[PDB]
Amino acid sequence: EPYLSSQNYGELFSNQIIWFVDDTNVYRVTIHKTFEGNLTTKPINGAIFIFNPRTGQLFLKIIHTSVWAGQKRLGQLAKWKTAEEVAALIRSLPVEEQPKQIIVTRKGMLDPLEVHLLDFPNIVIKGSELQLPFQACLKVEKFGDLILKATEPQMVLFNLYDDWLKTISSYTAFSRLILILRALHVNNDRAKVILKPDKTTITEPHHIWPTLTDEEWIKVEVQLKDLILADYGKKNNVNVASLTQSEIRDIILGMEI
């Protein structure tokens, strides 16, 4: 499976078009109370996240619950549907915009993609030793509201780097994005506080993330990193002070240490 690693991910920022494909939340449920009072779940709209780490481009394919109607083994179906939708997107693009590499968030996507991309034999499909939680996008109201409200499947295009590439590298933007996503992933409440340093902190309507000065981003990034390491340390009973620089890099990236 896992070719992408914390020691070769510099590759991500070169000339080949690369997509991460996350199928984690294609078939999706929410917790709800039955009015009768009891706790249980109900299926809600899902999404495929398809992400280019150099450009910041996000293809968001909303999956309406109607696809599940009358089907068994929804976990399996979700994987096969994701592969079908990724293949469809590739075919819809001119050859010069088609990816050369697909990196799957989950190994379960390896085989379905191989089968659907049988007519694109030179596309490399690989797993990742990292664990980049694109699912944390669901905790961003913009995305959470859009997916939940959908009445039909649809593709919506976004960019997860906002205007950052005007002043910082893809690597630096990726590193910022991963800090944001992993922080949201592990502690939604604390991350959103960190991402709102001033009462005047706002996000532009055409953006995903707050408008912050260069200096404000530095502080945010320190605080997010601090949150991720403390959370990890608590979960794994490891003292943060004991961590090496390399271990810290691995933790942020979601890699096993």
Which residues make up the interface to Na ion (CB under 5 A)? 128, 131
62: how many CB neighbours lie within 10 A of its CB? 21
Angstrom distance (rounded) from CA 204 to CA 22: 26
Nearer to Na ion, 154 or 213 (CB): 213
In angstroms, what is the minimal distance from the CB of 159 to Cl ion? Answer: 15
Q: Please report which residue ranges of 65-213 form alpha helices under DSSP H.
A: 74-92, 110-116, 141-149, 170-186, 188-194
3-class state of residue 145 by DSSP: helix
Nearer to Na ion, 148 or 165 (CB): 165
Binding mask 162-181 for Cl ion (x = CB under 5 A): -------xx-----------
Nearer to Na ion, 128 or 223 (CB): 128
Nearer to Na ion, 6 or 128 (CB): 128
Phi-psi region of 162 (alpha: psi -120 to 50; beta: other; left: phi over 0): left
In angstroms, what is the minimal distance from the CB of 112 to Cl ion? Answer: 32
In angstroms, what is the minimal distance from the CB of 7 to Cl ion? Answer: 19
CB contact at 8 A, 23 and 78:
yes
Question: Which of Na ion, Cl ion, none has residue 128 at its interface (CB below 5 to 8 Å by kind)?
Answer: Na ion
3-class state of residue 34 by DSSP: coil
Q: Which residues bind Cl ion (CB under 5 A)?
A: 169-170
